[PDB]
Design an enzyme around this catalytic site. Structure first.
Site, mmCIF file in Angstrom:
data_model
loop_
_atom_site.group_PDB
_atom_site.id
_atom_site.type_symbol
_atom_site.label_atom_id
_atom_site.label_comp_id
_atom_site.label_asym_id
_atom_site.label_seq_id
_atom_site.Cartn_x
_atom_site.Cartn_y
_atom_site.Cartn_z
ATOM 1 N N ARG B 120 -18.713 1.056 27.519
ATOM 2 C CA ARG B 120 -18.722 0.218 26.306
ATOM 3 C C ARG B 120 -20.083 0.061 25.687
ATOM 4 O O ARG B 120 -20.280 -0.814 24.851
ATOM 5 C CB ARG B 120 -18.075 -1.135 26.539
ATOM 6 C CG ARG B 120 -16.769 -1.081 27.352
ATOM 7 C CD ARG B 120 -15.959 -2.363 27.204
ATOM 8 N NE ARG B 120 -14.790 -2.455 28.044
ATOM 9 C CZ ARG B 120 -14.746 -2.699 29.353
ATOM 10 N NH1 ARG B 120 -15.839 -2.951 30.051
ATOM 11 N NH2 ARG B 120 -13.599 -2.662 29.964
ATOM 12 N N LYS B 142 -23.661 5.855 11.850
ATOM 13 C CA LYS B 142 -22.324 6.482 11.910
ATOM 14 C C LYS B 142 -22.342 7.519 13.034
ATOM 15 O O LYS B 142 -23.234 8.365 13.103
ATOM 16 C CB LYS B 142 -21.919 7.121 10.600
ATOM 17 C CG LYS B 142 -21.464 6.109 9.577
ATOM 18 C CD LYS B 142 -21.062 6.706 8.255
ATOM 19 C CE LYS B 142 -20.572 5.635 7.331
ATOM 20 N NZ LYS B 142 -19.951 6.197 6.076
ATOM 21 N N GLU B 184 -30.239 17.370 0.630
ATOM 22 C CA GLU B 184 -30.088 15.972 0.822
ATOM 23 C C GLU B 184 -31.440 15.255 0.546
ATOM 24 O O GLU B 184 -31.422 14.161 -0.003
ATOM 25 C CB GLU B 184 -29.644 15.683 2.250
ATOM 26 C CG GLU B 184 -28.242 16.183 2.592
ATOM 27 C CD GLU B 184 -27.086 15.472 1.955
ATOM 28 O OE1 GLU B 184 -25.945 15.983 2.181
ATOM 29 O OE2 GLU B 184 -27.277 14.502 1.195
ATOM 30 N N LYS B 226 -32.846 5.912 2.718
ATOM 31 C CA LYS B 226 -31.513 5.700 3.212
ATOM 32 C C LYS B 226 -31.366 4.291 3.837
ATOM 33 O O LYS B 226 -30.393 3.599 3.601
ATOM 34 C CB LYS B 226 -31.066 6.794 4.215
ATOM 35 C CG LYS B 226 -29.597 6.791 4.404
ATOM 36 C CD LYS B 226 -29.099 7.715 5.524
ATOM 37 C CE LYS B 226 -27.578 7.550 5.714
ATOM 38 N NZ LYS B 226 -27.053 8.570 6.653
ATOM 39 N N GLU B 236 -21.656 -6.736 1.504
ATOM 40 C CA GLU B 236 -21.324 -6.727 0.071
ATOM 41 C C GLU B 236 -20.115 -5.922 -0.342
ATOM 42 O O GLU B 236 -19.679 -6.117 -1.458
ATOM 43 C CB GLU B 236 -22.434 -6.156 -0.777
ATOM 44 C CG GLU B 236 -23.209 -7.228 -1.507
ATOM 45 C CD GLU B 236 -24.638 -6.879 -1.469
ATOM 46 O OE1 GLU B 236 -24.909 -5.779 -1.986
ATOM 47 O OE2 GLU B 236 -25.437 -7.658 -0.903
ATOM 48 N N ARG B 241 -23.807 1.949 -0.799
ATOM 49 C CA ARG B 241 -23.852 2.989 0.180
ATOM 50 C C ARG B 241 -23.095 4.232 -0.339
ATOM 51 O O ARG B 241 -23.375 5.330 0.074
ATOM 52 C CB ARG B 241 -23.150 2.499 1.426
ATOM 53 C CG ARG B 241 -23.529 3.232 2.653
ATOM 54 C CD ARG B 241 -23.173 2.394 3.881
ATOM 55 N NE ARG B 241 -23.423 3.219 5.089
ATOM 56 C CZ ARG B 241 -23.607 2.703 6.307
ATOM 57 N NH1 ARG B 241 -23.567 1.354 6.485
ATOM 58 N NH2 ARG B 241 -23.819 3.521 7.307
ATOM 59 N N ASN B 245 -23.151 9.594 -1.728
ATOM 60 C CA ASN B 245 -22.205 10.707 -1.973
ATOM 61 C C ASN B 245 -22.434 11.452 -3.258
ATOM 62 O O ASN B 245 -21.558 12.195 -3.671
ATOM 63 C CB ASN B 245 -20.729 10.144 -1.916
ATOM 64 C CG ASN B 245 -20.266 9.923 -0.497
ATOM 65 O OD1 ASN B 245 -20.728 10.595 0.415
ATOM 66 N ND2 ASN B 245 -19.391 8.975 -0.321
ATOM 67 N N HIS B 248 -21.196 15.060 -3.520
ATOM 68 C CA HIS B 248 -20.341 15.318 -2.355
ATOM 69 C C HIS B 248 -18.869 15.442 -2.715
ATOM 70 O O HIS B 248 -18.064 16.007 -1.920
ATOM 71 C CB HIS B 248 -20.558 14.213 -1.280
ATOM 72 C CG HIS B 248 -21.868 14.328 -0.536
ATOM 73 N ND1 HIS B 248 -23.111 14.300 -1.140
ATOM 74 C CD2 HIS B 248 -22.096 14.521 0.788
ATOM 75 C CE1 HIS B 248 -24.051 14.426 -0.198
ATOM 76 N NE2 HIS B 248 -23.443 14.639 0.977
ATOM 77 N N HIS B 252 -17.407 18.790 -1.584
ATOM 78 C CA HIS B 252 -16.301 18.853 -0.626
ATOM 79 C C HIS B 252 -15.284 19.862 -1.093
ATOM 80 O O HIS B 252 -14.769 20.629 -0.291
ATOM 81 C CB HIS B 252 -15.584 17.481 -0.501
ATOM 82 C CG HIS B 252 -14.331 17.558 0.286
ATOM 83 N ND1 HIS B 252 -14.339 17.851 1.632
ATOM 84 C CD2 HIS B 252 -13.026 17.456 -0.061
ATOM 85 C CE1 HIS B 252 -13.105 17.942 2.094
ATOM 86 N NE2 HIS B 252 -12.288 17.720 1.088
ATOM 87 N N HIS B 265 -23.128 22.804 4.028
ATOM 88 C CA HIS B 265 -22.902 21.530 3.374
ATOM 89 C C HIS B 265 -23.915 21.262 2.254
ATOM 90 O O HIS B 265 -23.555 20.839 1.137
ATOM 91 C CB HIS B 265 -22.975 20.380 4.451
ATOM 92 C CG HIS B 265 -22.854 19.012 3.857
ATOM 93 N ND1 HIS B 265 -21.660 18.527 3.316
ATOM 94 C CD2 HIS B 265 -23.783 18.036 3.716
ATOM 95 C CE1 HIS B 265 -21.891 17.289 2.861
ATOM 96 N NE2 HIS B 265 -23.179 16.955 3.146
#
Ligand SMILES: NC(=O)c1ccc[n+]([C@@H]2O[C@H](COP(=O)([O-])OP(=O)(O)OC[C@H]3O[C@@H](n4cnc5c(N)ncnc54)[C@H](O)[C@@H]3O)[C@@H](O)[C@H]2O)c1
Ligand SMILES: NC(=O)c1ccc[n+]([C@@H]2O[C@H](COP(=O)([O-])OP(=O)(O)OC[C@H]3O[C@@H](n4cnc5c(N)ncnc54)[C@H](O)[C@@H]3O)[C@@H](O)[C@H]2O)c1
Ligand SMILES: [Mg+2]
Ligand SMILES: [Mg+2]
Lengths: 354, 362
Positions: B120, B142, B184, B226, B236, B241, B245, B248, B252, B265
């Protein structure tokens, strides 16, 4: 009656609601509301008993329900099985606003909870615990996990539910052995934290065994209250306060390990363990025989063992257990004491040989 | 040596960036003598950096185990992650261990989620070896693995204790992957900091040449940027955030239609940013001069500014909608508003999107 516990941990709050026929109330499955989706995770034992009923109530409330039924058993608390929950969710196109509903005992609860923690990095989770053990233990603390072959509960997450729905009628189908196993953990709370609750148990244990609504509702409420207080006092396990929850579990783990799954249930092993811990506390000079006798007597009232298996000897316990033990200090007070001598523990085990 | 301190979700950690950082004093802080670490890497990085890093840790008193995983996005799976757990349990790693992610973003995500889930949660240190992972994975928390029905569908928010960026590791990175990372880098300039964009216009040649002083500043600033966007849009919702993208949604579509590894990518993002710029022109918020600056800088980084010859506008759209449900079909885009400023624009007309894509057909 209807009892309610609000738990406030890690800056979360959620309700635990407890009542006979709770599954049939309006907004019993709050915070789910009309237009939302739910995925019910349950096992093959509970499905024929409660899945249709719960699905019906949710669908009449505007909630879209899918379900997955797992086999019954501790061996299904697995990473590979959790992956199948993800597949069911993705096959039905469940987005991050879905809710996972754990309909079952602590096995289902743990697996579902970790699934909810991990699916899209966290979706909403509602517990519907159906064993006494899971009502009084799994419902607080946020521990979720699955097993690995090299260690139980080695893969998981701290993740709190949005709500816990306890319909006491579910206990009417629970085998009596599982009910007693749960009452070992109920009694534990009284020993470690609340001597007044222990006295209440001495006075009401017959009603609990009979599934009396008023006793059992209060019983569940107080265990959850007690557990939430100890987790809140050391949410990162700072002190050894949360460790107190392991009274009887060091001895009990040895019994479960040597006897094998389903031979002794967890609470049966814990029961005998608490006695062995009490005897240990006597031998180090801190507990009286009269106090220990109260623990023994009450465990027997709950139809729990107070002796170790004839089939194990004391030397079989210690390889599973220099030694860290949770010990009672009164009925209602407890401590972690490390550095207990192995010969003290073996003498305590020997005092519980049938 | 540059240093960025990041503080998100009540955690705080350093990102340290320097040439030859793997060899320096307490480079893998907070690991300290007597503690354990498990290094997770892949079969490509192992012969290049595993021994070096193990030696430095062991010289510091740190007891090291390692596991080498196969290289590839197709291995970013729950089942491969399970092998990490097995290695940890086989060597009796307790809750006080540290997982070290030695590799790119694939290693970083899988290791991060491994660290989040093992007992955990255990401590996690990032050692990112691609430019993309240095400038993107290093902030946000992430972590994830893929499922066959969706990328990054299984994971956890979990932050590292520290991020160790030794610029020398970029010397072995294929040039195509360096450029993909610079897509990026450039994105940051467009969405959040026009002065950084102008710095990129002056320094992109040095970055392509792996100049230590430029690249250290480049990585420091991207992480700073970032972190600022994530920190503002933690509590918020809405989507500050979501600005991350830019390009993107178009990109994609390209990745989805062209297939795995055909366009990297950052190559897809590059062309996507151009399409986003064109879209911003057509709604009346951006100038061709602004778009031209984006195009020019992308080309300097050896990135595409046109879509694949194989794709027509109607090939993009089914991929760009949120979904294809009756109440779906909506095209939500991140658009630049200046060089340095950006916005979420909801419900963009299909005719606008087709015109913007059409403007970028080779
Ligand atoms: N904090 C926590 O997360 C926590 C705490 C304690 C235990 N656990 C975990 O919980 C698990 C044990 O849970 P358990 O004791 O509830 O066992 P369990 O979930 O296996 O259920 C016990 C048995 O009773 C059946 N059953 C459950 N409810 C029933 C009902 N209403 N009617 C008929 N049969 C029913 C089950 O199908 C099963 O056969 C272990 O995996 C343990 O690690 C977790
Ligand atoms: N916030 C986040 O967590 C986040 C952000 C961005 C991307 N990601 C994830 O990161 C992944 C993409 O990461 P990536 O672009 O680093 O790809 P990658 O990790 O697959 O690395 C690209 C390739 O370069 C090789 N490699 C890496 N460093 C090397 C070096 N120094 N020398 C020689 N070869 C090297 C790798 O082994 C691989 O073949 C995706 O899965 C994406 O989801 C996550
Ligand atoms: Mg227990
Ligand atoms: Mg990207």
């Amino acid at each position: 009656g209807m009892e309610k516990v609000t738990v406030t941990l890690d800056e979360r709050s959620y309700p635990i609601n407890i009542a006979p026929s709770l599954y049939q109330q309006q907004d019993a499955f709050w915070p789910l509301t009309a237009g939302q989706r739910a995925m019910i995770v349950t096992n093959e034992t509970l499905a024929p008993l409660y899945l249709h009923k719960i699905q019906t109530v949710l669908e009449v409330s505007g909630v879209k329900v899918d379900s997955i039924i797992l086999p019954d058993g501790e061996q299904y608390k697995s990473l590979f099985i959790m992956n199948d929950v993800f597949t069911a969710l993705l096959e039905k196109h469940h987005n991050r606003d879905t809710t996972l509903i754990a309909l079952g005992g602590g096995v289902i609860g743990d697996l579902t909870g970790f699934a909810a923690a991990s699916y899209q990095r966290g979706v909403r989770f509602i517990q519907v615990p159906t064993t006494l053990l899971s009502q009084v233990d799994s419902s607080v603390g946020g521990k979720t996990a699955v097993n690995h072959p090299l260690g139980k509960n080695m893969i998981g997450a701290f993740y709190q539910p949005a709500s816990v729905v306890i319909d006491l009628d579910c206990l009417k189908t629970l085998p009596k052995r599982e009910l007693s196993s749960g009452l070992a953990e109920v009694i534990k709370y009284g020993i470690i934290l609340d001597g007044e609750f222990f006295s209440w148990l001495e006075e009401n244990i017959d009603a609990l065994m009979a599934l009396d609504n008023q006793a059992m509702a209060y019983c569940i409420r107080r265990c959850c209250e007690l557990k939430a207080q100890v987790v809140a006092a050391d949410e990162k396990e700072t002190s050894g306060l949360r460790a107190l929850l392991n009274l009887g579990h060091t001895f009990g783990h040895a019994i479960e390990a040597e006897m094998g799954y389903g031979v002794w249930l967890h609470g049966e092993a814990v029961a005998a363990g608490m006695v062995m811990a009490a005897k240990t506390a006597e031998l180090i000079g801190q507990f009286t025989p009269e106090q220990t006798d109260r623990v023994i007597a009450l465990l027997k009232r709950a139809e729990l063992p107070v002796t170790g298996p004839a089939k194990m000897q004391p030397d079989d316990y210690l390889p599973h257990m220099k030694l860290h033990l949770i010990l009672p200090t009164t009925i209602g007070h407890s401590e972690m004491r490390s550095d207990v001598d192995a010969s003290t523990v073996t003498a305590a085990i020997s005092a519980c040989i049938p």
